[PDB]
């Protein structure tokens, strides 16, 4: 499975939303290369205008990218379930508004590593930070914490993401995440530790498109 990174891999995103009854779609495209622990990714809005704030989107849109020192290789799950690929489950509380679920499917297509989502949001406050956009454009750096899930054959993950509000405050996204193979061969399942994640937001200058441009390091640790 690690085999088919060494090099810099094409990556295609597709996800399908609908939060509040907004129904939106958005299309990414860029490459990661895991030796670096290094992803570039565009994303468009191909429906119009995004309903909900960029950042808060960002978990949801390939941590078989992440760097695992050579050390902890033998607890990169991530890796060990390509190609056939894994599905990936979370859960995402907004702090006193609504909630995201998600479910993707991760895998290659031919050479290409795919995330293809489908994303539900309910409970949103008509003008909460979500729905009321009031989220900088913006991301801090933080943890993801991960344990094995023996039963499953897979993975659980457990984080909090902080979303700075335009006013100096924070909204917390609670996430909690599992992952399960989707092929039947051996995966890693792995001791605990976590994933030390950097994000970095932009825009095209020549893209009119409602988008957003990712640089995110991701690099494994705590073993
Ligand atoms: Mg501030």
């Given at each position: 499975?690690?085999?088919?990174?060494?090099?810099?891999?094409?990556?295609l995103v597709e996800l399908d939303?609908?939060?509040?009854?907004?129904?939106?779609?958005?299309?990414?495209?860029?490459?990661?290369?895991?030796?670096?622990?290094?992803?570039?990714?565009?994303?468009?809005?191909?429906?119009?205008?995004?309903?909900?704030?960029?950042?808060?989107?960002?978990?949801?849109?390939?941590?078989?990218?992440?760097?695992?020192?050579?050390?902890?290789?033998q607890h990169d799950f991530f890796?060990?379930?390509?190609?056939?690929?894994?599905?990936?489950?979370?859960?995402?509380?907004?702090?006193?508004?609504?909630?995201?679920?998600?479910?993707?499917?991760?895998?290659?297509?031919?050479?290409?590593?795919?995330?293809?989502?489908?994303?539900?949001?309910?409970?949103?406050?008509e003008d909460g930070n979500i729905?009321?956009?009031?989220?900088?454009?913006?991301?801090?750096?933080?943890?993801?914490?991960?344990?094995?899930?023996?039963?499953?054959?897979?993975?659980?993950?457990?984080?909090?993401?902080?979303?700075?509000?335009?006013?100096?405050?924070?909204?917390?996204?609670?996430?909690?995440?599992?992952?399960?193979?989707?092929?039947?061969?051996?995966?890693?399942?792995?001791?605990?530790?976590?994933?030390?994640?950097?994000?970095?937001?932009?825009?095209?200058?020549?893209?009119?498109?409602?988008?957003?441009?990712?640089?995110?390091?991701?690099?494994?640790?705590?073993?």
């Open positions: 499975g690690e085999e088919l990174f060494t090099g810099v891999v094409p990556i939303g609908d939060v509040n009854g907004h129904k939106f779609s958005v299309s990414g495209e860029g490459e990661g290369d895991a030796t670096y622990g290094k992803l570039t990714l565009k994303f468009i809005c191909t429906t119009g205008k995004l309903p909900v704030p960029w950042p808060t989107l960002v978990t949801t849109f390939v941590q078989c990218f992440s760097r695992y020192p050579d050390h902890m290789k890796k060990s379930a390509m190609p056939e690929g894994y599905v990936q489950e979370r859960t995402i509380s907004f702090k006193d508004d609504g909630n995201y679920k998600t479910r993707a499917e991760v895998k290659f297509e031919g050479d290409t590593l795919v995330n293809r989502i489908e994303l539900k949001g309910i409970d949103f406050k729905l009321g956009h009031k989220l900088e454009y913006n991301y801090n750096s933080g943890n993801v914490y991960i344990t094995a899930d023996k039963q499953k054959n897979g993975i659980k993950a457990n984080f909090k993401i902080r979303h700075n509000i335009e006013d100096g405050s924070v909204q917390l996204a609670d996430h909690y995440q599992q992952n399960t193979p989707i092929g039947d061969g051996p995966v890693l399942l792995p001791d605990n530790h976590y994933l030390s994640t950097q994000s970095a937001l932009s825009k095209d200058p020549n893209e009119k498109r409602d988008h957003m441009v990712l640089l995110e390091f991701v690099t494994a640790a705590g073993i």
